[PDB]
Amino acid sequence: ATQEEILDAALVSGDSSQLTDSHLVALRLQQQVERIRQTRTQLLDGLYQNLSQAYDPGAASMWVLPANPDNTLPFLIGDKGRVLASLSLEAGGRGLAYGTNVLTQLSGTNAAHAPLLKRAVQWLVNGDPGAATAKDFKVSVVGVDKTAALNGLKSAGLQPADAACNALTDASCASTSKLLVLGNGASAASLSATVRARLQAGLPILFVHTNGWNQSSTGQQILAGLGLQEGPYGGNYWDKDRVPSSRTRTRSVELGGAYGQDPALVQQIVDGSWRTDYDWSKCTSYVGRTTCDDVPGLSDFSKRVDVLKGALDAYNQKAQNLFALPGTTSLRLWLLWADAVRQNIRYPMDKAADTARFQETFVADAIVGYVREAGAAQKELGSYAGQRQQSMPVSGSEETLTLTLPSAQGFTAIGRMAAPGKRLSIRIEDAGQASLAVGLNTQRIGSTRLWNTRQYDRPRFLKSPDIKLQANQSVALVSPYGGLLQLVYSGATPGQTVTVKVTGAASQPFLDIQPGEDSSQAIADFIQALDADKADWLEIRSGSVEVHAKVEKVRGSIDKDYGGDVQRFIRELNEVFIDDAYTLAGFAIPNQAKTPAIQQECAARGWDCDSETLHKLPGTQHINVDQYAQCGGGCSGNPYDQTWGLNPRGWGESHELGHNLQVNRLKVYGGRSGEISNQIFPLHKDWRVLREFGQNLDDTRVNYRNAYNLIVAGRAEADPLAGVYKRLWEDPGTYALNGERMAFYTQWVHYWADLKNDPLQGWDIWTLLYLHQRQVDKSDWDANKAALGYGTYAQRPGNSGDASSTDGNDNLLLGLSWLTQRDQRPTFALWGIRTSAAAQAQVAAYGFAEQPAFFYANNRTNEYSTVKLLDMSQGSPAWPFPL
Ligand SMILES: [Zn+2]
């Protein structure tokens, strides 16, 4: 078969598998775009002639936009670019929609529009804007006032007669009526479908939005029947856009022909006239990531490409197959062109060395249609994947999976992959009240480093749009890239399940630790899948953490850090990394009782330390392990990105996990502890690792010595609390005084260890503070405040994260005083930490003996046997370790 014959077939089926000649497709697209422009401009020129185009719908109006570009078009575009009315040629019919009821303004504010409206109505009735209507032409008016509408039409020089019947819902009235006028009061079965069917059968429709700047679902449905869409929330309220009387024929004809179309970009594609002289010296670099926002001309190019992506991604998001909807040829050609381009992409490309390949690929990467029955794999997957991903076996039968949702909103790995160019079918069942979508992959967009020299080596958009699903309705997908399937959810009940059915999917290595079940078999099966080595990507689900990882990166870590010992790697991931953090935070972990000391303290305080209501595990934290990251070689977020691999014992792993587990009421001076109060997680892990294993990791993180220097100097000032504050907490820098501020947090660990007379118990104070804080945050205030040491508070305290707030300082003071049964105000003052009068009154009410100011000093972070206690109440001792 010729490429010509392949293209013709693929326009019907969507099957681009054998289509490689992108130039041929681009030539067809060129003629299609030109056909659309010729049709539009001829119609708009006939409508406008030299009549005034003045049209002012006021603030109390909505915008009304084309939705299908092939058969709809703007009619009135204001100076600010807002579409105020649109024309429809959908299904071979004739429709016109305004964003306000212009018919009742033809004697007033829009008297000047009457001549033009007359031509538009001539075009509706006759199909020719210069053909006069017959006297007494029958007009049916539905959902807006009949008399006022007919009087409006008369005001424009027309002589309508009342059809006296409902042409929206009565097929016989539709057949004799010359025009149907609609507003938002209409009633009908299947309103969009009914409107479409009337239009297709030849009833001309004039729609007027009757709800001002308010949106209308009836209007949205009518407009969808015309192939139009309502503009966004607020309507014309802020912009107050209008067409001025100075608007020329030529200008509006040009704007209307160009709207939502890019003939210049099509021509650049066809001719290969990609820009050879972008000024790349204007790019800049931030932590190794190059961006180019200030390269002249580049942002405008990128925004034009975004229009195309936006257009196709609306179909993706709605789970609509473009090839199943009539009147979508332009978009079909764009998509088939991009699929053809994907057959020829080769990596890597550089922005200066390979301008034509780089720029054409830049466009093609933005145009991916996932909802289809067939289509092509991209031939080269570069730094993303390789031959394994391309050759993964797929299941011919339906697979059934049950997923648990740990919070109301987020996404979770389904445990299967789309294979490149291979159809899969998916559906969800048993979803309760959750709203669901399916997605592919988890990459963040900064992880395609296309502006770095020679690093355009994968697709721009490896993560698909979220593809909405309805319960019990199957959707067919084809990805050019393959990818890890994700269930995206919102409005869920924590702990609920969902059933996923999928046919045609591949099975990546997938480790699904069962919350409180034996896992030695799951581990063995995962290892066996890794040993078979048929995949480029894997996933791991363990508690509230999910890892999405390039296989080669995980192998690298197992080899480097574990000498090839996969078993120990996995067990440490689960226990030393994940379980360590969530246990430190005191969450209710299924089938894992609290330690005896935590149990006993909680019991002695009469606390709820075990309910799911207060202490359920939080929403999933995702981790991406890949060749590239969103920012730097590793980036905060959810997911957070790592490019080195995945080390269960690593500082960064736990530092980032810790950000997910931070709470404002345990931060000193809000944001000043933004990179402090999360460090308990990696510090605890390192203390544990030294004791159990003997590796001594990050042993100089906590800078007790320099904290001491700053405290000793600041407390010599006239206001000693302010003096310390200035030297320790004032600096707003992201990582300012990181080591010194950490030494505050560990004071309480050493203190608690001494209080309990047990070195192993020291970190329990943080677990207790977390348990206490979640009760403060969520328990019934009146019933629980006495038990939480907050009896003097009429209302729950605030949760501000601002550095100027005392909400964290206060809760730390109260929690620590309450748990230790000593008034801790002198040590809080020593550290420069101010508290509110309310919190001070509350500590006074406890009736506890003061703990005089103290300081725990050490010359190592991880080894606590050497820590020394300094009494600070009478003066400042010497630093007690030799320099
Ligand atoms: Zn951080």
Side-chain angles (χ1 to χ4, degrees), residues 1-516 518-883:
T2 62
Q3 285 290 301
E4 190 74 286
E5 288 154 8
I6 289 154
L7 174 55
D8 290 342
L11 282 154
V12 175
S13 63
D15 190 2
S16 50
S17 290
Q18 307 307 326
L19 182 67
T20 55
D21 191 342
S22 71
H23 186 67
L24 169 82
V25 186
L27 288 173
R28 286 262 209 123
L29 180 59
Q30 181 201 59
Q31 299 302 304
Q32 175 65 16
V33 165
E34 174 64 8
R35 183 172 306 121
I36 291 166
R37 191 198 61 78
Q38 289 178 18
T39 297
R40 292 184 180 182
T41 52
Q42 180 179 290
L43 170 59
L44 288 178
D45 187 86
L47 286 161
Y48 304 136
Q49 302 283 264
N50 295 323
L51 305 179
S52 178
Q53 290 180 53
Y55 172 81
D56 187 4
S61 67
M62 282 285 326
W63 304 332
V64 172
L65 290 71
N68 172 35
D70 292 28
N71 298 308
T72 65
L73 65 148
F75 179 41
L76 299 151
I77 305 173
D79 277 357
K80 307 176 176 188
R82 303 316 187 182
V83 190
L84 312 183
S86 286
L87 295 147
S88 177
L89 320 172
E90 213 49 274
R94 296 187 303 266
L96 176 57
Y98 291 92
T100 195
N101 189 349
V102 69
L103 302 171
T104 59
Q105 310 181 16
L106 299 172
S107 293
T109 313
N110 285 295
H113 182 65
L116 179 49
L117 185 144
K118 182 173 167 187
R119 288 186 73 77
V121 173
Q122 289 171 168
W123 171 72
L124 286 166
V125 173
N126 294 320
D128 172 3
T133 50
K135 180 175 180 192
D136 296 336
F137 71 103
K138 292 175 200 292
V139 182
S140 176
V141 185
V142 172
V144 58
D145 184 73
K146 178 192 310 208
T147 300
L150 295 178
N151 288 342
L153 292 172
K154 287 171 203 191
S155 288
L158 303 150
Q159 293 180 288
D162 181 8
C165 55
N166 187 322
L168 179 65
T169 57
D170 175 342
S172 150
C173 182
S175 74
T176 62
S177 286
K178 298 297 170 189
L179 178 67
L180 169 59
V181 179
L182 287 171
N184 295 333
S187 302
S190 301
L191 183 48
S192 299
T194 293
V195 170
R196 182 64 59 95
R198 297 287 182 252
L199 204 63
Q200 178 152 13
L203 177 67
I205 293 173
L206 177 58
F207 169 74
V208 293
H209 174 81
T210 51
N211 296 107
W213 58 59
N214 303 116
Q215 299 156 302
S216 169
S217 173
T218 291
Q220 292 164 17
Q221 292 173 52
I222 290 163
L223 285 176
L226 304 178
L228 307 177
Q229 64 190 313
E230 208 183 49
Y233 180 83
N236 203 34
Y237 174 87
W238 297 298
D239 289 333
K240 299 201 273 290
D241 202 10
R242 60 180 192 93
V243 188
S245 65
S246 65
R247 180 66 67 72
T248 66
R249 178 182 190 159
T250 292
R251 179 51 171 170
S252 291
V253 170
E254 288 175 346
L255 288 172
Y259 177 90
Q261 294 272 73
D262 204 330
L265 176 61
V266 179
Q267 195 65 26
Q268 182 171 43
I269 292 163
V270 164
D271 292 334
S273 54
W274 302 108
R275 185 161 177 182
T276 58
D277 64 354
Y278 276 118
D279 184 4
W280 299 125
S281 78
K282 302 294 189 204
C283 298
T284 57
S285 180
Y286 181 67
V287 197
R289 183 174 174 233
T290 300
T291 53
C292 297
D293 295 26
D294 297 329
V295 172
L298 192 59
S299 292
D300 293 331
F301 175 65
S302 183
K303 286 166 174 170
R304 292 163 59 210
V305 174
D306 284 347
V307 166
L308 292 170
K309 185 172 168 52
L312 186 54
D313 284 353
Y315 294 80
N316 285 324
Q317 284 169 348
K318 283 159 86 185
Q320 295 171 146
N321 179 346
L322 187 69
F323 301 89
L325 298 178
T328 57
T329 303
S330 300
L331 250 177
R332 288 185 202 198
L333 285 164
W334 275 113
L335 177 50
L336 299 172
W337 171 76
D339 282 6
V341 168
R342 284 186 265 284
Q343 306 278 6
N344 303 300
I345 285 171
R346 294 182 291 110
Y347 293 129
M349 286 170 284
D350 173 67
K351 65 188 181 290
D354 306 292
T355 53
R357 281 170 52 226
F358 183 111
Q359 292 168 39
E360 177 161 81
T361 303
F362 180 92
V363 184
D365 275 3
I367 308 170
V368 180
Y370 293 94
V371 183
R372 58 216 284 195
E373 301 295 332
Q378 178 162 319
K379 178 179 169 74
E380 299 296 341
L381 298 177
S383 67
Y384 165 62
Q387 151 274 313
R388 283 162 185 88
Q389 185 134 320
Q390 299 277 9
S391 60
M392 295 180 299
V394 295
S395 174
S397 49
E398 178 165 273
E399 305 187 84
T400 299
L401 307 161
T402 306
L403 297 173
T404 298
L405 318 183
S407 68
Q409 188 170 286
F411 74 90
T412 189
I414 286 169
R416 295 293 184 282
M417 288 190 83
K422 303 214 182 161
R423 178 186 176 281
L424 68 88
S425 185
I426 186 163
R427 92 173 178 282
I428 54 80
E429 289 176 353
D430 310 311
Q433 304 315 126
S435 177
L436 300 172
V438 57
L440 291 157
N441 291 331
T442 64
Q443 276 76 9
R444 300 152 79 181
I445 64 172
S447 70
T448 296
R449 296 293 184 89
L450 70 168
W451 311 116
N452 284 72
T453 293
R454 216 161 166 287
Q455 289 177 28
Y456 196 8
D457 61 11
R458 48 166 62 189
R460 291 168 74 199
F461 299 112
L462 279 167
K463 183 183 166 98
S464 74
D466 292 339
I467 294 163
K468 188 84 189 70
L469 296 168
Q470 312 307 319
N472 320 295
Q473 157 198 116
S474 300
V475 183
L477 302 186
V478 176
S479 170
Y481 311 133
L484 299 167
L485 291 155
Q486 314 298 317
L487 183 70
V488 183
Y489 58 89
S490 59
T493 300
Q496 77 164 91
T497 57
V498 174
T499 303
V500 179
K501 306 285 192 68
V502 65
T503 299
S507 287
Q508 73 276 30
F510 190 75
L511 177 59
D512 199 2
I513 303 294
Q514 290 307 17
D518 181 14
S519 282
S520 46
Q521 184 50 251
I523 291 177
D525 293 350
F526 176 66
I527 286 164
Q528 178 186 37
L530 282 181
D531 294 342
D533 196 37
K534 304 302 208 217
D536 292 313
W537 285 83
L538 68 76
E539 282 169 316
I540 298 172
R541 171 165 37 242
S542 179
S544 284
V545 172
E546 289 185 12
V547 178
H548 317 271
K550 210 168 182 207
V551 171
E552 164 269 322
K553 293 288 195 185
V554 174
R555 288 195 203 273
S557 297
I558 294 169
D559 294 346
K560 173 181 201 269
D561 303 325
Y562 289 76
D565 192 344
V566 194
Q567 281 279 350
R568 181 161 71 84
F569 172 86
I570 296 164
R571 294 164 183 246
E572 289 194 11
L573 187 74
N574 288 331
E575 296 143 22
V576 178
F577 172 39
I578 295 166
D579 191 58
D580 193 82
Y582 292 88
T583 298
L584 183 63
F587 290 105
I589 294 166
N591 283 11
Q592 269 177 220
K594 296 309 178 291
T595 58
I598 297 293
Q599 258 160 35
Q600 293 163 20
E601 179 73 36
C602 283
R605 307 196 135 273
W607 283 352
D608 170 3
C609 291
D610 288 279
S611 77
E612 296 298 316
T613 304
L614 298 179
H615 305 297
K616 64 177 141 287
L617 288 159
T620 305
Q621 172 68 67
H622 299 272
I623 309 180
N624 285 341
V625 180
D626 201 355
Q627 187 157 335
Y628 298 103
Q630 171 65 27
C631 71
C635 200
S636 311
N638 191 356
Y640 59 90
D641 293 359
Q642 313 195 149
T643 61
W644 54 86
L646 180 68
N647 181 1
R649 298 189 193 181
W651 179 269
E653 281 78 357
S654 286
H655 169 93
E656 293 301 334
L657 184 57
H659 281 307
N660 184 260
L661 303 184
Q662 280 174 293
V663 293
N664 293 342
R665 296 191 186 90
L666 297 177
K667 288 175 195 186
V668 172
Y669 289 121
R672 302 301 201 267
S673 291
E675 301 289 346
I676 310 299
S677 66
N678 58 318
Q679 302 287 45
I680 64 167
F681 297 97
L683 287 171
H684 177 269
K685 192 172 71 180
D686 291 352
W687 169 76
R688 174 174 172 184
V689 159
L690 180 62
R691 176 185 67 255
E692 296 189 10
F693 302 122
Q695 269 189 338
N696 183 35
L697 301 174
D698 264 294
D699 201 30
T700 58
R701 286 282 178 168
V702 181
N703 194 342
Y704 295 97
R705 188 181 43 83
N706 202 48
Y708 196 66
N709 286 334
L710 297 170
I711 286 169
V712 170
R715 79 187 297 215
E717 294 187 12
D719 179 352
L721 195 159
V724 177
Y725 170 80
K726 284 178 262 171
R727 286 169 175 82
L728 182 55
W729 302 99
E730 155 246 302
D731 187 336
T734 300
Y735 283 92
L737 289 146
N738 200 260
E740 297 86 350
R741 296 177 188 172
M742 281 190 273
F744 180 71
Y745 282 72
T746 65
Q747 296 298 303
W748 305 102
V749 174
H750 304 307
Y751 189 79
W752 191 257
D754 277 349
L755 208 63
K756 295 297 122 176
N757 197 20
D758 184 351
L760 294 178
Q761 289 183 53
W763 279 97
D764 293 351
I765 186 60
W766 283 105
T767 309
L768 297 154
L769 287 168
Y770 263 81
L771 285 161
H772 174 257
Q773 194 287 146
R774 281 188 299 274
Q775 294 170 88
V776 173
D777 188 53
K778 299 176 289 197
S779 79
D780 177 276
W781 187 246
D782 194 58
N784 296 98
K785 66 185 189 180
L788 300 177
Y790 272 94
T792 70
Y793 278 56
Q795 304 184 269
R796 191 185 314 279
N799 197 33
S800 182
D802 196 88
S804 60
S805 180
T806 55
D807 291 351
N809 297 355
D810 283 356
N811 179 256
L812 283 162
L813 176 61
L814 294 177
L816 281 166
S817 301
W818 191 236
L819 283 161
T820 62
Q821 305 182 156
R822 304 289 293 270
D823 170 6
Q824 296 302 344
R825 287 178 285 183
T827 300
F828 273 58
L830 180 71
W831 283 89
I833 299 169
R834 75 158 162 129
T835 50
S836 71
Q840 297 209 37
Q842 175 70 79
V843 173
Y846 301 160
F848 291 153
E850 215 175 62
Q851 165 68 64
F854 68 87
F855 182 94
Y856 287 95
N858 207 0
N859 68 349
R860 289 182 63 184
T861 296
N862 303 324
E863 180 48 75
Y864 296 176
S865 69
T866 54
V867 69
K868 290 176 182 310
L869 175 56
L870 300 184
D871 175 358
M872 306 293 293
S873 55
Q874 310 281 54
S876 298
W879 179 250
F881 297 89
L883 284 13

